[PDB]
From a paper:
The flagellar stator unit uses the transmembrane ion motive force (IMF) to generate mechanical torque to rotate the flagellum, which is employed by many bacteria to direct their locomotion in liquid environment or on viscous surfaces to a favorable niche. PomAB assembles the characteristic bell shape of the stator unit family, with conserved 5:2 subunit stoichiometry and overall architecture. Five PomA molecules arrange pseudo-symmetrically around two PomB, with each PomA subunit comprising four transmembrane helices (TM1-TM4) folded into two radial layers.
The high-resolution PomAB structure was determined in a detergent micelle environment, raising the possibility that detergent molecules could have an impact on the conformation of PomAB, particularly the membrane-facing helices, including the disordered TM1 from two PomA subunits. In both cases, we were able to trace all the secondary structure elements of the PomAB complex, except the two PomA TM1 helices. This indicates that the flexibility of those two TM1 helices in the inactive stator unit is probably intrinsic, which might be functionally important during stator unit activation.
Residue numbers in the entry:
A (entry chain A): 3 to 252
B (entry chain E), E (entry chain B): 20 to 252
C (entry chain D): 1 to 243
D (entry chain C): 1 to 251
F (entry chain F), G (entry chain G): 11 to 61
Write the structure that this text describes.
Amino acid sequence: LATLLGLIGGFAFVIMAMVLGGSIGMFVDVTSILIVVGGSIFVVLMKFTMGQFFGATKIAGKAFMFKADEPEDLIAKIVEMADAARKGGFLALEEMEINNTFMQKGIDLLVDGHDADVVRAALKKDIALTDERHTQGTGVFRAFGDVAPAMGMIGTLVGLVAMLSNMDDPKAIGPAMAVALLTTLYGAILSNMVFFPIADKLSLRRDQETLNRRLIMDGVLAIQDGQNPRVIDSYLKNYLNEGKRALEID
Amino acid sequence: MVLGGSIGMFVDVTSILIVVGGSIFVVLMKFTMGQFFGATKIAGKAFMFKADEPEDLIAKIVEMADAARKGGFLALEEMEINNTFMQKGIDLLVDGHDADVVRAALKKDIALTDERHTQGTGVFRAFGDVAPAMGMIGTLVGLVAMLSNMDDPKAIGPAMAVALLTTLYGAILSNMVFFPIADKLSLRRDQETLNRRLIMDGVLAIQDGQNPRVIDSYLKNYLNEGKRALEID
Amino acid sequence: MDLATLLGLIGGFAFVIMAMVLGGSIGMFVDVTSILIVVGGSIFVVLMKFTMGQFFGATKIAGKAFMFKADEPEDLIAKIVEMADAARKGGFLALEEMEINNTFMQKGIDLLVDGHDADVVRAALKKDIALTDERHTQGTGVFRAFGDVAPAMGMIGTLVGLVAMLSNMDDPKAIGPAMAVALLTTLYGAILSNMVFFPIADKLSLRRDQETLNRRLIMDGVLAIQDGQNPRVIDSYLKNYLN
Amino acid sequence: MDLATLLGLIGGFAFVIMAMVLGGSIGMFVDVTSILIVVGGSIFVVLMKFTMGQFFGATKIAGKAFMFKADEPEDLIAKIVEMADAARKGGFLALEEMEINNTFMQKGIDLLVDGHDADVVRAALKKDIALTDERHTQGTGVFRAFGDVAPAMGMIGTLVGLVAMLSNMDDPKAIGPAMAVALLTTLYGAILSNMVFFPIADKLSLRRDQETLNRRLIMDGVLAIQDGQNPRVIDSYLKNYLNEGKRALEI
Amino acid sequence: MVLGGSIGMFVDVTSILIVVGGSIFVVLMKFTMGQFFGATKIAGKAFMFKADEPEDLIAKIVEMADAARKGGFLALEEMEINNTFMQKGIDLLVDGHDADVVRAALKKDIALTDERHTQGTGVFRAFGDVAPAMGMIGTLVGLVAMLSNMDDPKAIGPAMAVALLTTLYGAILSNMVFFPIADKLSLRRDQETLNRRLIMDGVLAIQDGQNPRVIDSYLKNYLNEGKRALEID
Amino acid sequence: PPPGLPLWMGTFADLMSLLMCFFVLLLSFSEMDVLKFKQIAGSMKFAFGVQ
Amino acid sequence: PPPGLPLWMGTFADLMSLLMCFFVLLLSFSEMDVLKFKQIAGSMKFAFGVQ
């Protein structure tokens, strides 16, 4: 994603312009980041099990490395199987090539032979399932963002009491105090630029996937009804003027 | 500022980078670059163009209705039109389309504009929420850099400059730039709803053939409730 | 307000002022530039959410909440059952001879006696109650915005003053007084936020709640008046709605 | 007095002894300007929102909560059933021959024996319960406002103290005590908020719950006596209401 | 409190007393002693025990479903149930009562458990809110003590130690014990409510003389709501 | 969601960090008495479990 | 309900207060060095674009 390239560029520029005054070793510490991340995982794990946290992590991974199918390529595909059914019925749907799991599941339920109610119930259950899955991932990362600064300040306090146990020199208090504050800095950065942004991007991917899934169930319901692609064109592009994609258009 | 000194005393590449770049990064992590440009476009249009006076719209709706009644349903294409949405209404009425289809088109346009304004308000309120957080982060970075380099004044100076100006920039952008822009977009959204409601109802009355004497009275029923109630008694 | 309440307010202000006096000179804590920065910036920022008419309306509605007290509910029930008895022993024309206690009730009975239907009178009172409620909500919003931005303006002014102080040191013994003056802006912003704007906003919200209850009671009372119902039932119904 | 208030008093005494031992003396935790700022600003702000009469009513209800322990509900039920037996086997006139420690129940009993019908009796008892609930809610609101404003006033006073210390700061190596005096105002705000006003508001909430439960039991009992129901049936009714009226945390 | 080198650094009786005792005082003013002790018991039960897994619940319910389908409402007595709520439900089934009364009783019991867990969560959230506030009281007391006796070195140490350790204990107790305990209580509330809804649905489905397999489908419908379905892939 | 903490606490923390910066400045151009810093250092070690 | 600041903001202000007062304590026994003051002031006027 171009947003990911912008993320990499911003990361590099921010680091380079932060570490310019002195050396990178003052703002880099594996112990501080380890303290913050370990304490935050432990706290969230008291309220989420290992499986639900790994699920949230894997959904975040899917939301970052991969990209949701565009709701325009989706239109091309839906009108394609609309033409296929109009020329040769539902018997032409299976040999087609589909790269989206949800339309494939819908049509594989359609081929067997089922009326509108059962297929609609199955599709709505799947849409609600994926929406809830993304919602729990956003909840996990909101919890991570809420607890990361608290763990960073606890780490800072522990570092400060460790510093107050190691004195006798006017010159070590400054570097020691800086290393102690590094934990709070890492907690703030992880809260504001990782965990809350990851939760926000998870909510964004939830919105994109929910919009795509309503588009797909409506497309499959129209194809099962056997409607022609004309009125279908309008009744599916009208859903493309909601959310943020209707903001980006001019 | 100008009495304290100059604008030159608030300039730092590191502080500007921290606050603005971090805010942009956070917002782009939940918004697309093109949608953010669209929000900037709508903010610029809200700032460079005042919303049309509701009284002017009611009066002008009455004049087109008079013209239509004098010269049939095709008499509104010879004199100037102010905005593009009513222009679209006019060029759909000139096509002799039925009431339901034009009503659907106008309701889609109102909903689209409402979504654009609400989304612009959301983007800029996100910007205003993240800017002071970045200012606090900048204060923390500058404090760490100061404490790490207390023996070097050449490092003490820039570190405190980062710490102070990150907070100053976060506060200024949040409370004087980003939140004010979001508030202006919310106000402009309310104005759009009032003008669009007045015009679609006017088009509906013209299409229905209602005499303009009742139409003006009906449209006046809208202007007497809204945010302007602090001026009314 | 009550003389006891005004005396207590003046006493608290006096206590704060003397406590300021005992900590040294009071001209040490006075700076015209800082108060101009805070007040002018707050007005400038708030004017990007409210027009001058809206700001003056909020000022007026906050001012009339300090010199007029919301009418106590029992007096309203007593008065409404009084005109209930008046209508039963007399007619609708007997209400005109009753002198002015509340503007809302007066305009309601005036719209009631000039010959209008029950539903239209109910609608007029409903619009007026909603109008007053939204007026109070906008005033609360104005003062909440002032209380939210005043600390922000205090912090911008302290940072600007401190940057000006760091721009030319030239003297180590002059650092402290400069920082004191710069912090004066934060002190004024905090005082205006937490002692003036948020208290009036909270008071106006509270006055919104009592006024909504009171106006609901008056509207129910006048609607009962138009029914020509039994006044004892009105008293019982209103007392039940109180609890 | 309950265990909570005794614990608070002993904890405050231990806090004072700890402070004096830590600081050697006690006169540096006492500053007239800081106390004046916090108390005067809190009263000032609270009086912008409540009347002086309301402030006195809140103070009185708090004093009554901290001086008179609420009656235990079982004792009230025992009293209602014994006078119920007395009225069942002695009529209404037998109700003026035994002592009553409760002013609200005494008012209900006189109102019951003076021949008033059920409608007026219920209306008056409901009015009394609503007045007590409104008094307690208003007191809770007043003390909540005090707890909300006291630390804000403390931060204002600490700003005043910092301005005073820095304005009088030449060659900073004697600024310790002045900085401590500046912090005293926020210390006062924190102590008044966390240890006085919010605890008083919470105890007023608990007393509101207790008095609502107690008053509902007594009104139900008095109305049952007005109709002369059997003492055992009304006894059963009160037991069911108390066990369902009890929360889930203690069952 | 281990990264300092040992535990002996992070121990002061004064800080522990001020923080824990102040928090305890505030909580007993907010809540009665019975509520506080009940909250402690429910937290201990939620941590040391585990709610019955819904899978086993559906298996057992369909087991008695088939048992009732082969022998009507009389076979249920002769098998063992390790769960208290389903046993009370089946007892209310076999004692010859109608669906309405048993449904009312089960609804009352579910609401009672939900309210008990909610109040325990409230108690521990009050603890986690007050603990940092007590840390703030201790920080100010210790800092006042420190600034007052700057000329007394033997008084400087303990005052700063109390000030720092009060804050450390308040932060640790609030964010790593009390708020986590409240969150665990909320998690157990959601899980427990789901399990009890499964059991009430199973009981109503067994009364309804209905096939066990459609019963199984309705119960499997409940396994994809909440945090469990996030784990489900 | 929990209501959170009031804005005055945020102002107080921002002011506290500003005062940190300026007190770091005053200690930046200063020469600590080495003799007077070890009695207090010994006292903090004594009061923290080390001694 | 109108939102506020996160619950860790109180601990952050706590930490800011503790550190500030640690620096006033360190500043209590530290003597000013005027040459270092001139150097830091020059670096300060360089870092703020004032030459």
